[PDB]
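Chapter review. Work through the record for HSP90AA1 protein before attempting the end-of-chapter questions.
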Amino acid sequence: EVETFAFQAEIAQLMSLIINTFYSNKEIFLRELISNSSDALDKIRYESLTDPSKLDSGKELHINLIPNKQDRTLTIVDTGIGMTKADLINNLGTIAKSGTKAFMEALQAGADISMIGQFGVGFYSAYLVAEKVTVITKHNDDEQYAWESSAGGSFTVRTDTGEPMGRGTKVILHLKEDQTEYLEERRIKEIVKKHSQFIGYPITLFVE
Ligand SMILES: C#CCCCn1cnc(N)c2nc(Sc3ccc(C)cc3C)nc1-2
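C-alpha coordinates for HSP90AA1 protein:
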Protein backbone atom coordinates (compact mmCIF):
# COMPACT_ATOMS: atom_id res chain seq x y z
CA GLU A 1 0.00 0.00 0.00
CA VAL A 2 1.38 3.38 -1.09
CA GLU A 3 0.30 6.51 0.78
CA THR A 4 0.55 9.92 -0.88
CA PHE A 5 1.02 13.12 1.15
CA ALA A 6 1.30 16.83 0.41
CA PHE A 7 4.41 18.67 1.55
CA GLN A 8 3.71 21.60 3.82
CA ALA A 9 3.37 24.66 1.58
CA GLU A 10 6.60 26.18 2.91
CA ILE A 11 8.57 23.02 2.07
CA ALA A 12 7.03 22.84 -1.42
CA GLN A 13 8.13 26.47 -1.85
CA LEU A 14 11.68 25.61 -0.74
CA MET A 15 11.85 22.71 -3.18
CA SER A 16 10.59 24.94 -6.03
CA LEU A 17 13.25 27.54 -5.19
CA ILE A 18 15.96 24.84 -5.24
CA ILE A 19 14.72 23.51 -8.60
CA ASN A 20 14.07 26.90 -10.28
CA THR A 21 16.87 29.22 -9.11
CA PHE A 22 19.86 29.58 -11.42
CA TYR A 23 22.78 28.44 -9.29
CA SER A 24 25.84 26.66 -10.70
CA ASN A 25 27.49 25.40 -7.47
CA LYS A 26 25.32 22.26 -7.31
CA GLU A 27 28.05 20.00 -5.86
CA ILE A 28 27.24 21.14 -2.31
CA PHE A 29 24.34 18.64 -2.21
CA LEU A 30 26.82 15.89 -1.32
CA ARG A 31 28.27 17.65 1.74
CA GLU A 32 24.72 18.21 2.99
CA LEU A 33 23.75 14.54 2.73
CA ILE A 34 27.05 13.37 4.23
CA SER A 35 26.54 15.88 7.07
CA ASN A 36 23.09 14.39 7.75
CA SER A 37 24.58 10.88 7.75
CA SER A 38 27.29 12.00 10.19
CA ASP A 39 24.63 13.48 12.49
CA ALA A 40 22.63 10.23 12.33
CA LEU A 41 25.73 8.22 13.23
CA ASP A 42 26.52 10.60 16.11
CA LYS A 43 22.99 10.06 17.41
CA ILE A 44 23.02 6.25 17.47
CA ARG A 45 26.53 6.27 18.96
CA TYR A 46 25.36 8.57 21.78
CA GLU A 47 22.22 6.51 22.47
CA SER A 48 24.26 3.28 22.51
CA LEU A 49 26.26 4.50 25.53
CA THR A 50 23.21 4.24 27.81
CA ASP A 51 21.56 1.38 25.90
CA PRO A 52 24.12 -0.96 24.23
CA SER A 53 21.29 -3.10 22.79
CA LYS A 54 20.64 -0.30 20.28
CA LEU A 55 23.64 -1.59 18.29
CA ASP A 56 22.23 -5.15 18.06
CA SER A 57 21.01 -4.04 14.62
CA GLY A 58 24.65 -3.38 13.62
CA LYS A 59 27.81 -2.20 15.39
CA GLU A 60 29.57 -0.70 12.35
CA LEU A 61 29.19 3.07 11.98
CA HIS A 62 30.04 4.22 8.47
CA ILE A 63 28.98 5.86 5.21
CA ASN A 64 29.00 4.32 1.72
CA LEU A 65 28.77 6.28 -1.54
CA ILE A 66 27.52 4.08 -4.36
CA PRO A 67 27.32 5.26 -7.97
CA ASN A 68 25.43 3.21 -10.56
CA LYS A 69 25.65 4.35 -14.19
CA GLN A 70 23.09 1.82 -15.48
CA ASP A 71 20.42 3.07 -13.05
CA ARG A 72 21.75 6.67 -13.13
CA THR A 73 21.72 6.76 -9.32
CA LEU A 74 24.03 7.97 -6.59
CA THR A 75 23.25 6.40 -3.23
CA ILE A 76 24.40 7.76 0.12
CA VAL A 77 24.21 4.95 2.70
CA ASP A 78 24.68 5.29 6.45
CA THR A 79 24.30 2.98 9.43
CA GLY A 80 22.99 5.81 11.63
CA ILE A 81 19.87 6.05 13.78
CA GLY A 82 17.46 5.81 10.83
CA MET A 83 13.98 7.31 10.64
CA THR A 84 10.53 6.46 11.94
CA LYS A 85 7.34 6.69 9.88
CA ALA A 86 6.47 9.84 11.87
CA ASP A 87 9.88 11.32 10.97
CA LEU A 88 9.16 10.82 7.27
CA ILE A 89 5.53 11.92 7.18
CA ASN A 90 5.38 14.80 9.66
CA ASN A 91 8.22 15.54 12.04
CA LEU A 92 11.25 16.33 9.88
CA GLY A 93 9.17 18.57 7.60
CA THR A 94 7.58 20.32 10.59
CA ILE A 95 11.00 21.13 12.08
CA ALA A 96 12.22 22.20 8.61
CA LYS A 97 9.58 24.97 8.48
CA SER A 98 11.51 27.41 10.69
CA GLY A 99 14.82 26.77 8.91
CA THR A 100 13.09 27.25 5.55
CA LYS A 101 11.68 30.66 6.57
CA ALA A 102 15.08 31.79 7.90
CA PHE A 103 16.84 30.49 4.76
CA MET A 104 14.51 32.28 2.34
CA GLU A 105 14.89 35.50 4.36
CA ALA A 106 18.68 35.14 4.26
CA LEU A 107 18.67 34.63 0.47
CA GLN A 108 16.82 37.94 0.04
CA ALA A 109 19.48 39.56 2.27
CA GLY A 110 22.40 38.30 0.15
CA ALA A 111 23.00 34.66 1.14
CA ASP A 112 23.35 31.91 -1.47
CA ILE A 113 22.05 28.33 -1.80
CA SER A 114 25.38 26.81 -0.62
CA MET A 115 24.53 28.11 2.87
CA ILE A 116 21.39 25.92 3.06
CA GLY A 117 22.91 23.62 5.72
CA GLN A 118 23.34 26.55 8.13
CA PHE A 119 19.53 26.55 8.34
CA GLY A 120 19.11 22.80 8.90
CA VAL A 121 17.31 22.07 5.63
CA GLY A 122 20.23 20.70 3.58
CA PHE A 123 18.41 17.48 2.63
CA TYR A 124 16.30 19.35 0.08
CA SER A 125 19.45 20.41 -1.80
CA ALA A 126 19.29 16.88 -3.22
CA TYR A 127 16.93 18.42 -5.78
CA LEU A 128 19.80 20.44 -7.24
CA VAL A 129 20.90 17.26 -9.00
CA ALA A 130 18.11 14.68 -8.60
CA GLU A 131 14.83 14.43 -10.53
CA LYS A 132 13.60 11.93 -7.93
CA VAL A 133 14.83 11.01 -4.45
CA THR A 134 14.09 7.69 -2.75
CA VAL A 135 14.84 7.27 0.95
CA ILE A 136 14.99 3.73 2.36
CA THR A 137 15.29 3.79 6.13
CA LYS A 138 15.20 1.54 9.19
CA HIS A 139 15.00 2.74 12.81
CA ASN A 140 15.20 0.41 15.82
CA ASP A 141 11.74 -0.83 16.93
CA ASP A 142 10.07 0.40 13.72
CA GLU A 143 9.62 -1.12 10.25
CA GLN A 144 11.65 -0.42 7.11
CA TYR A 145 10.12 2.37 5.01
CA ALA A 146 10.54 3.85 1.55
CA TRP A 147 9.91 7.58 1.16
CA GLU A 148 9.91 9.01 -2.36
CA SER A 149 9.37 12.33 -4.13
CA SER A 150 9.85 13.90 -7.54
CA ALA A 151 8.81 17.23 -5.99
CA GLY A 152 5.72 18.89 -7.50
CA GLY A 153 4.23 19.15 -4.00
CA SER A 154 3.79 15.50 -3.02
CA PHE A 155 5.69 12.54 -1.59
CA THR A 156 4.88 8.90 -0.91
CA VAL A 157 5.58 6.54 1.98
CA ARG A 158 5.30 2.75 1.92
CA THR A 159 6.51 -0.16 4.01
CA ASP A 160 9.57 -1.48 2.17
CA THR A 161 9.62 -5.20 1.38
CA GLY A 162 12.92 -4.82 -0.44
CA GLU A 163 16.29 -5.96 0.91
CA PRO A 164 16.43 -5.56 4.73
CA MET A 165 19.15 -3.07 5.78
CA GLY A 166 19.51 -3.62 9.56
CA ARG A 167 19.56 0.01 10.70
CA GLY A 168 20.24 3.31 8.95
CA THR A 169 19.32 5.27 5.86
CA LYS A 170 19.88 5.05 2.11
CA VAL A 171 19.30 8.23 0.12
CA ILE A 172 18.99 7.23 -3.54
CA LEU A 173 19.43 10.14 -5.94
CA HIS A 174 17.92 9.54 -9.36
CA LEU A 175 20.09 12.06 -11.20
CA LYS A 176 18.88 14.57 -13.78
CA GLU A 177 20.10 13.77 -17.31
CA ASP A 178 22.63 16.63 -17.30
CA GLN A 179 24.00 15.82 -13.83
CA THR A 180 25.70 12.47 -14.53
CA GLU A 181 29.12 13.90 -13.54
CA TYR A 182 28.20 12.89 -9.98
CA LEU A 183 28.52 9.25 -11.02
CA GLU A 184 32.21 9.70 -11.89
CA GLU A 185 34.78 8.43 -9.38
CA ARG A 186 37.16 11.38 -9.86
CA ARG A 187 34.32 13.87 -9.38
CA ILE A 188 32.93 12.32 -6.19
CA LYS A 189 36.47 11.98 -4.75
CA GLU A 190 37.10 15.65 -5.49
CA ILE A 191 33.88 16.77 -3.77
CA VAL A 192 34.40 14.62 -0.65
CA LYS A 193 37.95 15.99 -0.28
CA LYS A 194 36.76 19.58 -0.84
CA HIS A 195 33.72 19.66 1.49
CA SER A 196 33.69 16.54 3.71
CA GLN A 197 37.33 15.78 4.57
CA PHE A 198 36.98 15.72 8.39
CA ILE A 199 33.88 13.53 8.85
CA GLY A 200 34.48 11.25 11.86
CA TYR A 201 33.33 8.04 10.16
CA PRO A 202 34.74 6.02 7.25
CA ILE A 203 33.41 7.11 3.86
CA THR A 204 33.82 4.36 1.27
CA LEU A 205 33.43 5.38 -2.36
CA PHE A 206 32.32 2.32 -4.32
CA VAL A 207 33.48 2.01 -7.91
CA GLU A 208 31.99 0.65 -11.13
C1 LIG B 1 20.39 12.98 10.95
C2 LIG B 1 19.64 13.27 12.00
C3 LIG B 1 18.59 12.32 12.53
C4 LIG B 1 17.24 12.63 11.88
C5 LIG B 1 16.74 11.54 10.93
N1 LIG B 1 17.74 11.23 9.89
C6 LIG B 1 18.51 10.13 10.01
N2 LIG B 1 19.43 9.82 9.08
C7 LIG B 1 19.62 10.58 7.98
N3 LIG B 1 20.57 10.24 7.07
C8 LIG B 1 18.83 11.72 7.81
N4 LIG B 1 18.74 12.68 6.86
C9 LIG B 1 17.77 13.49 7.33
S1 LIG B 1 17.23 14.91 6.45
C10 LIG B 1 15.67 14.52 5.85
C11 LIG B 1 14.64 15.45 5.99
C12 LIG B 1 13.36 15.17 5.51
C13 LIG B 1 13.09 13.96 4.89
C14 LIG B 1 11.70 13.67 4.38
C15 LIG B 1 14.10 13.03 4.74
C16 LIG B 1 15.39 13.29 5.22
C17 LIG B 1 16.41 12.20 4.99
N5 LIG B 1 17.22 13.13 8.49
C18 LIG B 1 17.89 12.00 8.80
